[PDB]
Design a protein around this ligand. Sequence first.
Ligand code: HEM
Ligand SMILES: COc1ccc([C@](O)(c2cncnc2)C2CC2)cc1
Ligand SMILES: [Cl-]
Ligand SMILES: [Cl-]
Ligand SMILES: [Cl-]
Length: 407
Amino acid sequence: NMSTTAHTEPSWADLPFLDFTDPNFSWDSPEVAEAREKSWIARTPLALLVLRYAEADQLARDKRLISGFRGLVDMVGTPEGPVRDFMVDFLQSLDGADHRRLRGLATHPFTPRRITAVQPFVRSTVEQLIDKLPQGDFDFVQHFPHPLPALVMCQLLGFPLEDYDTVGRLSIETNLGLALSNDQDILVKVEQGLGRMFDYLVAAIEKRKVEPGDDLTSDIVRAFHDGVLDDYELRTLVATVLVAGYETTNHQLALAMYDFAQHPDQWMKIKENPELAPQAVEEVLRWSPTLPVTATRVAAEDFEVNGVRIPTGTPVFMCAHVAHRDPRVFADADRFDITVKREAPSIAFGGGPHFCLGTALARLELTEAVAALATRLDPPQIAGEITWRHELGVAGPDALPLRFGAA
Ligand code: HEM
Ligand SMILES: COc1ccc([C@](O)(c2cncnc2)C2CC2)cc1
Ligand SMILES: [Cl-]
Ligand SMILES: [Cl-]
Ligand SMILES: [Cl-]
């Protein structure tokens, strides 16, 4: 598909080739930096890959580039079932009128007022998790970046807080990163992963249809009562928020510690001036985004951008990780430095109408965590095997063993 298109497009002839599906591929490879230097966009086996900051934002907003997933499902050849249904009907797959309708129902808790309102819960959750941290070598994931976003997710969606372990486990086991797989045995455990999480969600939704609260599930239920969306759209929307809201926030917090394990001097600088936390979080998002590939799109028509023809059906992926090290935008881009007040933000949350719904909540959880950890604890250092997810498009430890302080 990408190979047949390449043989038909003269504007693709000088584009560098990057095989990110390869098991030994690194985003920090000198091959990748060369490709960005040579071209704003690269050829991959699955998609065109945008490597520069300016164009990554441009194309993430371009109306001629439809929001991905529907195109990737047909090309792979996913059979009809619970997996395909979710991958074609969930928020990231929709565009136009249906997208604005369904997204608008889940936008209220992410307004600047509601982020302020939920902030005390986030702060006290962080505080409590630090209080009960082990003194020696421990998995940072198990003891902090798993419980934190899980508890916040339970608070947001109106689940009992005691279910944070179950809720987080139900979010991981869905395995959306392996939903576009060609294998059947893989697609079966994705089907069963979704089913089990939907079993929890359906119970919580019908509970809200009789006794609603101040939570997000209650608000989407109000829209169901008003006939804005049906029952299928209800549980799909609540599922999307949940799955998206846990795993990447988890991984991002782990990546934050991994970064400061390499730069303990900068950790101490946050300890001195805790106000550096938001700037530090932005540097973590720039240097090590949990999603190195952010916005995924498919061309809905033949069009041209910056000298490159993009035919209908061509997948285009925005490579935020590489765009974050663009020297056209970032000074000393290949160095982790939290002390630099940067004009341009990270683009870790995509762009366009599909931009991360939980952007502000994600930044809140990251800031509250980094501020409190750096104030209260000594710099982290790695204490064993980091189990990186060998999954295409996602960066993050499944387990991060560490200690805070040498002694
Ligand atoms: C730091 C952790 C996070 C990162 C790096 C991240 C990143 C992203 C990215 C790159 C997208 C795609 C944007 C695009 O297509 O242009 C996205 C979409 C989305 N995110 Fe996140 N996200 C994070 C946390 C969260 C949280 C905490 C929530 C909910 C509380 C959330 C909910 C969503 C939803 C619902 C979408 C689909 C938006 C749509 O298609 O309308 N995410 N996220
Ligand atoms: C690698 O390109 C991707 C893949 C998956 C997503 C996703 O929407 C997400 C959103 N927010 C936080 N984490 C994950 C997954 C729920 C479907 C986004 C971009
Ligand atoms: Cl460059
Ligand atoms: Cl150039
Ligand atoms: Cl800068």
